[PDB]
Design a protein around this ligand. Structure first.
Ligand SMILES: [Gd]
Ligand SMILES: [Gd]
Ligand SMILES: [Gd]
Lengths: 170, 171
């Protein structure tokens, strides 16, 4: 997961377009929760920040667990609108960086944002992947050509991505 | 143990099509470590008898990897007891999940709720169960709490012990 060339990122991006409900309907590097509900609702904070809810779990010596909600907040790069940083993490001690490869926002059913992500913490510096957020719970057929072009721009191939439609859903 | 509840304590009328659409689980008697992940479920009705939604299946393999799949889970309503729904139904998955509707208010208002007590079994264990509140809202409404306390009481439980999980899909 090397950082992308700045030239392959969207050159303009308004973090306000991340507001509200988005489904993750495709991903490069899924986990075993790939088919659980993939709805995320985000909120903008001010000018340059995006906020959403995350969850924290510890597994203890009795086979029990403790869990908590937390926030994850991203700040946009002031020179590269397609780069967002979440370093931000206090007790949690990790960094997650987002790179917007491709996006179409027409306030239409087919709107999407394609994010490549990379991360690190004390245990490992290898974290990363790529996900497609769509307004629709079903990835729209019409956006696949642009997704294929975006994936190819970072040396990937979109046909390798897992497809996860209607994950909450009807 | 989660025994079968007294039939008299269940809702005496229930229309399964009232389960259609989007519901959030905003409270539960016994959570798993995924309690704070998004608790949105979208249900639909099949025929006039059956409630359907999407579930997920995982296996963890010897190499530390995994395989996963979407599946569906289908409930049928008991014809004599509107508040009893059965998911036996399950093919190669080999499990049973029974739902007992303790309390519900459906008025097509933001505070609508359905309070489900559940019990289950598979080859590994017969001890599965718990109780969850489905709400139309992503936040459990303060106004339904006295009915929930009463419903919890009817099966020998206390609503105050339940986990509260508001805004689980985002702020
Ligand atoms: Gd990699
Ligand atoms: Gd750095
Ligand atoms: Gd029990």
């Amino acid at each position: 997961f090397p950082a992308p060339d700045p030239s392959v990122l969207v050159q303009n991006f308004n973090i306000s377009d991340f507001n509200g409900k988005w489904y993750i309907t495709s991903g490069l590097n899924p986990t075993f929760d790939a088919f659980d509900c993939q709805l995320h609702e985000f909120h903008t904070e001010g000018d340059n920040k995006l906020v959403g809810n995350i969850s924290w779990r510890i597994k203890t010596l009795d086979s029990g667990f403790f869990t908590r909600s937390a926030v994850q907040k991203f700040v946009q790069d002031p020179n590269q609108p397609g780069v967002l940083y979440n370093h931000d993490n206090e007790y949690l001690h990790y960094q997650d960086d987002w790179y917007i490869l491709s996006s179409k926002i027409e306030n239409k059913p087919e709107d999407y944002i394609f994010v490549y992500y990379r991360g690190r913490n004390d245990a490992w510096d290898g974290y990363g992947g790529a996900v497609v957020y769509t307004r629709s719970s079903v990835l729209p057929n019409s956006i696949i050509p642009e997704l294929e072009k975006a994936a190819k721009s970072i040396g990937r191939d979109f046909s390798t991505f897992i497809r996860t439609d209607n994950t909450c859903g009807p």
